[PDB]
């Protein structure tokens, strides 16, 4: 289906304890392929997915130089933003950056995005048009002016709908065996009595790829959207994903309820029901 | 590939 390339950057000031902590990670869909950590011994952009290792020394030299440049930019920005908000030098603060692009099945551009944060709150973000910025407060409006003058938007759009899309297609092709595969979910159901006249039915999906899945409960073939505990889709650690949905049911009326599973890997949506 | 047109805040 639709694919994405995303880069995530966290910068955390450690006042009195030297340089700020810098963590950069690259994602194709929900798979990490590159990493930089300031506290790591390498001081290199490191491969984290098998299919990126066929990139030559030029790629690794370039991404190391460019990720270091982003680190240095974050180091300056932390000091600047500390000034804007008139905050003490003793206080530890966080800058978070995410940018990326989405492509369809054909591999053509769908959309691009960039968002910046300070202390886990919206600072400034590129708009859907990829030509203007939304500033959270007066401090971010100063950044917007400096980004408008430097033509950050025009150069970012050129990346998001050009470079970003091109390198995503290359990654997707090189990592074809893992990135463009579809594993359907192995499904089962568990039963947990809370008390008398009551019980929890939990609908499981394991070993599926990609992460995109829909678990919904029904009563007499009618969707029970409201009273449903839907846990966060989690990684298995082997490259697959896990999820469950749960509903509280009065004991005796287990047969009334069904769990629906929609996923790409399936040839037909599954419909589970509790069995002794 | 990383974005490289880095402007300070």
């Amino acid at each position: 289906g639709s694919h994405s390339m995303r880069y995530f950057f966290t910068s955390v000031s450690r006042p009195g304890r030297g340089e700020p902590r810098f963590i950069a990670v690259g994602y194709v869909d929900d798979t990490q392929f590159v990493r930089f950590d300031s506290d790591a011994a390498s001081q290199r952009m490191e491969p984290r997915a098998p299919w990126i290792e066929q990139e030559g020394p030029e790629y690794w030299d370039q991404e190391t130089r460019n990720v270091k440049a982003q680190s240095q930019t974050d180091r300056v920005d932390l000091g600047t933003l500390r000034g804007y908000y008139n905050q003490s030098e003793a206080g530890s603060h966080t800058i978070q950056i995410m940018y990326g692009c989405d492509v369809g099945s054909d591999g053509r551009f769908l959309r691009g995005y960039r968002q910046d944060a300070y202390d886990g709150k919206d600072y400034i973000a590129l708009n859907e048009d990829l030509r203007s910025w939304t500033a959270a407060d007066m401090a971010a409006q100063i950044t917007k002016r400096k980004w408008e003058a430097a033509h950050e938007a025009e150069q970012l759009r050129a990346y998001l709908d050009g470079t970003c899309v091109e390198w995503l297609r290359r990654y997707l092709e090189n990592g074809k065996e893992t990135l463009q595969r579809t594993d359907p979910p192995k499904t089962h159901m568990t039963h947990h009595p809370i008390s008398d006249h009551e019980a929890t039915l939990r609908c499981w999906a394991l070993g599926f790829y990609p992460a995109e899945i829909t678990l919904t409960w029904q009563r007499d073939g009618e969707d029970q959207t409201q009273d449903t505990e839907l846990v966060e889709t989690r990684p298995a650690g082997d490259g697959t994903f896990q999820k469950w949905a749960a509903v509280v049911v009065p004991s005796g009326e287990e047969q009334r309820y069904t769990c629906h599973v929609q996923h790409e890997g399936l040839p037909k949506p599954l419909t589970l029901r509790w069995e002794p | 590939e990383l974005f490289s047109y880095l402007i300070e805040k």
Partner: T-cell receptor
Amino acid sequence: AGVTQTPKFRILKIGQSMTLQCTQDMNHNYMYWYRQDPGMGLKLIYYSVGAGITDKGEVPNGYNVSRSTTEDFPLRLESAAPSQTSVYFCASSETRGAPYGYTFGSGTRLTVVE
Amino acid sequence: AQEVTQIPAALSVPEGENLVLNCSFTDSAIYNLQWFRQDPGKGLTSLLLIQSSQREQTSGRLNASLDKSSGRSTLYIAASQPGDSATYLCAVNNAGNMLTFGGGTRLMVKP
């Protein structure tokens, strides 16, 4: 005014130590050290993106730098060698992008002798 | 990595005649391109600064073009005169490598 570079020239024995001074009062976060052999272009030795950090350039070997303050960025030669005979240029900028270009010093002509 | 080249490294031109100085760079992802003048023993003098968005810059008898496609820049000197005689350096700035200089072209404008 701008970037001030001392000294203008120096004749130094093979192995002797020297500290090239570079100052700017424009409050620039970014400061750079280049060297230029005869008939060649400038080659980045070391740079600093602010007070308290330095990072190696293209030809950092045989050179040491510090950045205690925003103002100063001195370049130190631990042990002078024949290959370190060159013209040294210091630079500064407000941003990495430097949309007005870099502010450059006059230059320091270094001669290493046996 | 960013490799800036200037061929030829030397150019002899008679007074009054127009001339071209060549600059090629390998990384077309750039902030700006810069042309410097260097007199023997002296420092650098900034002639023109072309932004990545801009296509050309003009300052009197000096014109400079930018082509990120091929990764080339040309400096056009109109009605050349002995005063124009100097070493001309091509510099390219980007995040990864910062301001990176070519070898330079020693221009001789003969009377």
